[PDB]
Motif scaffolding. Structure first.
Motif, PDB file in Angstrom:
ATOM      1  N   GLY A   1       5.099  18.603   8.037  1.00 52.61           N
ATOM      2  CA  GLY A   1       4.793  18.629   6.623  1.00 52.61           C
ATOM      3  C   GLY A   1       3.357  18.340   6.223  1.00 52.61           C
ATOM      4  N   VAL A   2       2.379  18.529   7.120  1.00 56.64           N
ATOM      5  CA  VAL A   2       0.961  18.451   6.712  1.00 56.64           C
ATOM      6  C   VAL A   2       0.398  19.860   6.425  1.00 56.64           C
ATOM      7  CG1 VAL A   2      -1.411  17.631   7.317  1.00 56.64           C
ATOM      8  CG2 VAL A   2       0.468  16.077   7.474  1.00 56.64           C
ATOM      9  N   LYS A   3      -0.258  19.961   5.276  1.00 55.83           N
ATOM     10  CA  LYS A   3      -0.661  21.230   4.666  1.00 55.83           C
ATOM     11  C   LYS A   3      -1.586  22.069   5.559  1.00 55.83           C
ATOM     12  CE  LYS A   3      -3.795  18.141   4.111  1.00 55.83           C
ATOM     13  NZ  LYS A   3      -4.658  18.113   5.362  1.00 55.83           N
ATOM     14  N   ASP A   4      -2.621  21.429   6.096  1.00 50.52           N
ATOM     15  CA  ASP A   4      -3.598  22.048   7.024  1.00 50.52           C
ATOM     16  C   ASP A   4      -3.845  21.133   8.237  1.00 50.52           C
ATOM     17  OD1 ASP A   4      -4.386  22.775   4.086  1.00 50.52           O
ATOM     18  OD2 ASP A   4      -5.118  24.469   5.281  1.00 50.52           O
TER      19      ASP A   4
ATOM     20  N   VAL B   1       0.849  -1.141   0.000  1.00 55.10           N
ATOM     21  CA  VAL B   1       0.000   0.000   0.000  1.00 55.10           C
ATOM     22  C   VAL B   1       0.898   1.208   0.000  1.00 55.10           C
ATOM     23  CG1 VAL B   1      -2.149   0.813   0.884  1.00 55.10           C
ATOM     24  CG2 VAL B   1      -1.427  -1.434   1.471  1.00 55.10           C
ATOM     25  N   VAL B   2       0.566   2.168  -0.865  1.00 51.70           N
ATOM     26  CA  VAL B   2       1.392   3.316  -1.070  1.00 51.70           C
ATOM     27  C   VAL B   2       0.511   4.533  -1.092  1.00 51.70           C
ATOM     28  CG1 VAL B   2       2.976   4.518  -2.762  1.00 51.70           C
ATOM     29  CG2 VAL B   2       3.149   2.028  -2.410  1.00 51.70           C
ATOM     30  N   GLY B   3       0.915   5.530  -0.322  1.00 51.89           N
ATOM     31  CA  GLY B   3       0.469   6.884  -0.580  1.00 51.89           C
ATOM     32  C   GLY B   3       0.379   7.653   0.708  1.00 51.89           C
ATOM     33  N   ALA B   4       0.265   8.980   0.588  1.00 49.40           N
ATOM     34  CA  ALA B   4       0.048   9.964   1.656  1.00 49.40           C
ATOM     35  C   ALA B   4      -0.940   9.561   2.723  1.00 49.40           C
ATOM     36  CB  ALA B   4      -0.372  11.303   1.044  1.00 49.40           C
ATOM     37  N   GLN B   5      -2.018   8.918   2.278  1.00 51.18           N
ATOM     38  CA  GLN B   5      -3.083   8.454   3.211  1.00 51.18           C
ATOM     39  C   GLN B   5      -2.593   7.341   4.128  1.00 51.18           C
ATOM     40  OE1 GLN B   5      -5.704  10.249   4.003  1.00 51.18           O
ATOM     41  NE2 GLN B   5      -4.843  11.600   2.426  1.00 51.18           N
ATOM     42  N   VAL B   6      -1.658   6.517   3.637  1.00 55.69           N
ATOM     43  CA  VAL B   6      -1.013   5.495   4.489  1.00 55.69           C
ATOM     44  C   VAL B   6      -0.252   6.134   5.652  1.00 55.69           C
ATOM     45  CG1 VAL B   6       0.566   3.426   4.714  1.00 55.69           C
ATOM     46  CG2 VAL B   6      -0.752   3.938   2.563  1.00 55.69           C
ATOM     47  N   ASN B   7       0.751   6.958   5.346  1.00 53.53           N
ATOM     48  CA  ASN B   7       1.483   7.805   6.307  1.00 53.53           C
ATOM     49  C   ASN B   7       0.644   8.629   7.331  1.00 53.53           C
ATOM     50  OD1 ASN B   7       3.368   6.990   4.325  1.00 53.53           O
ATOM     51  ND2 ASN B   7       4.272   9.016   4.063  1.00 53.53           N
ATOM     52  N   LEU B   8      -0.480   9.168   6.894  1.00 54.13           N
ATOM     53  CA  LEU B   8      -1.305   9.979   7.767  1.00 54.13           C
ATOM     54  C   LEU B   8      -1.857   9.083   8.881  1.00 54.13           C
ATOM     55  CD1 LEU B   8      -3.029  12.492   8.661  1.00 54.13           C
ATOM     56  CD2 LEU B   8      -4.474  12.037   6.661  1.00 54.13           C
TER      57      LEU B   8
END
Lengths: 201, 197
Positions: A175-178, A129-136
């Motif tokens: 490094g999270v935008k909002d 599984v890959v992506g920004a949503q994984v890390n969050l």
């Protein structure tokens, strides 16, 4: 998989400071406590139709929505989170009578679009599984102390009001935008009726 | 049912910026890029006697010293890092040959005592490594930018003079109280003779 981008619900757990205190234990005790914990969690995950994506030191990464999805992926994930915490009381009675101190566990859950598919080499492919949503999801898990389940707003909306909540926290990891609001889970209502604290009659 | 506490050199790599970049790719492309990268890294690692512990959506955990040890694992770990960076140039020829952005990679290496053992489910259980010194190597690596290998001083002391270093830096990662000195690796000498710039 060959590759799909899709909404899933990601759950991740970790053993709040067992890294540290395991340094004091004999190597067989570390492995034994961990197997008791992993075995017991794997039972609750399976009962809720989750995919154990990986065992990571003293952490677990779980998917609801991959390889197969359903309408209640997010609900099942939250219900799985609550029952994971409740199953830990059991593992802690055993760990405790092995002469060792009890484990505490934190859980983060996030729902969102991720890439899923078979990642790896010849002799060693991994369903990944890959992506920004994984890390969050890891990041959400990080705010948690022992016994807590933190979930993002997208998991709450996706799961629905059968998810019972104590309140929210607004955070913004490096490094999270909002800022993201995360929700402190109390329990899940019908048909699960799972609670971290008992509704006192 | 159990395992052993022992000193091992652990290497970890990371595709800097990739999570973020993958969010723009088609999903077949994300998987293909990972597979090209892992295919070749696995080649380099296997050639150096490293044990691949895990593959992550953009990452590798490798061990030098488990389940088989020997004393200059640590130099062989650093050599492997250097070859990994160099091998990335071939993966990139293919990645960019598909019209896709080149990968950059950072790598952290640390040497210390960990617990290692068989771990996980009652069914499909893998070979695991646990301890603060595993987490330390991921911390060490988080300071890296594309093309850079950072090593702990325990790793540099185990490996010795044949590790050539660009310079030093002292960091205080959170949780761990004392600051770790980390070293910027330029290359390795005999017999590998492998250099990064």
């Amino acid at each position: 998989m060959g590759g799909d981008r899709r909404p899933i619900t990601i759950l991740t757990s970790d053993l709040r400071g067992f890294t540290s205190t395991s340094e004091g234990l004999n190597p067989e005790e570390v492995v034994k406590v961990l197997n008791i914990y992993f075995g017991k969690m794997a039972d609750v995950i399976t009962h809720h139709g989750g995919t154990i994506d990986e065992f990571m030191g003293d952490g677990i990464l779980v998917l609801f929505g991959a390889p197969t999805s359903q309408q209640d992926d997010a609900l099942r994930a939250v219900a799985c989170g609550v029952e994971m915490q409740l199953a830990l009381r059991e593992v802690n009675q055993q760990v405790t009578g092995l002469g060792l101190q009890p484990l505490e566990m934190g859980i983060g859950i996030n729902t969102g679009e991720v890439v899923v598919g078979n990642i790896g080499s010849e002799k060693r492919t991994k369903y990944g599984v890959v992506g920004a949503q994984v890390n969050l999801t890891y990041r959400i898990e990080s705010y948690t102390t022992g016994g807590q389940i933190f979930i993002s707003s997208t998991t709450l909306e996706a799961a629905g009001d059968r998810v019972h909540v104590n309140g929210n926290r607004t955070v913004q990891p490096k490094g999270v935008k909002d800022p993201v609001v995360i929700w402190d889970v109390a329990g899940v209502g019908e048909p699960y009726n799972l609670s971290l604290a008992v509704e006192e009659q």
